[PDB]
Amino acid sequence: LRPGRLDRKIHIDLPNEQARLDILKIHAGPITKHGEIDYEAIVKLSDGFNGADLRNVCTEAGMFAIRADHDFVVQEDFMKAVRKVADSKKLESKLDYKPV
């Protein structure tokens, strides 16, 4: 860790509200969505999430649509997906460590 070998210690922390919104847009772009999609609600419900969890939100929304036998996703599916991933997150220890 000496500043002659690893000069810069870049910190990639969990996304903020804006970071969550951008990640959600990136991962939900390619989905065939019918109706208005309010990413702000998903962002508010996705506190403490990481990029992988925000992608899993879209994946689970698509899975809910497939289960319903629909060729499109809806805000209800997105809300169900965020709730599902939030429930799943309980099995993980949320803690970060620093270069000390």
Partner 1 sequence: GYDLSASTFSPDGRVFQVEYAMKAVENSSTAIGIRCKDGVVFGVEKLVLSKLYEEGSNKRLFNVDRHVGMAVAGLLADARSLADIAREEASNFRSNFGYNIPLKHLADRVAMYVHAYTLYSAVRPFGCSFMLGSYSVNDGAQLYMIDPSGVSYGYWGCAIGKARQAAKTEIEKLQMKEMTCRDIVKEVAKIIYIVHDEVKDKAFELELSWVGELTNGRHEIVPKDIREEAEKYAKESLK
Partner 2 sequence: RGSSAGFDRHITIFSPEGRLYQVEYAFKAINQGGLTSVAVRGKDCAVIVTQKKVPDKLLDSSTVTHLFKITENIGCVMTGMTADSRSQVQRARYEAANWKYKYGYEIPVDMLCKRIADISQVYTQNAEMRPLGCCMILIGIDEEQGPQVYKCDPAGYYCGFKATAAGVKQTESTSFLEKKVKKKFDWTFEQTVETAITCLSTVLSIDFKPSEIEVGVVTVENPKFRILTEAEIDAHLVAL
Partner 3 sequence: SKMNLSEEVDLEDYVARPDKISGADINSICQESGMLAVRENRYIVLAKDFEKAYKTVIKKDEQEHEFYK
Q: Which residues are annotated as a binding site for ADP?
A: 55
4 binds partner 3 (CB under 8 A): yes
Q: What is the closest distance, in whole angstroms, from the C-beta atom of residue 95 to partner 3 in the complex?
A: 14
Residue ranges of the annotated binding site are 2, 5, 27, 50, 55
Q: Are 57 and 93 in contact (CB under 8 A)?
A: no
Specify the residue for token string 């065939």. 32
30 binds partner 3 (CB under 8 A): no
Burial group, residue 51, by CB count within 10 angstroms (0-12, 13-18, 19+): middle
Break positions in the chain: residue before each gap, C to N over 2.5 angstroms: none
17 binds partner 2 (CB under 8 A): yes
Specify the residue for token string 């965020």. 82
From 6, 47, 52, 72, residue interacting with partner 2 (rule: CB under 8 A): 47
Q: With CB under 8 A as the contact rule, which of the stretches 1-9, 27-35, 66-74, 86-94 interacts with partner 3?
A: 1-9
Paired residues of 73 in beta bridges: 33
Residues that bind partner 2 (CB under 8 A): 16-18, 41, 44-45, 47
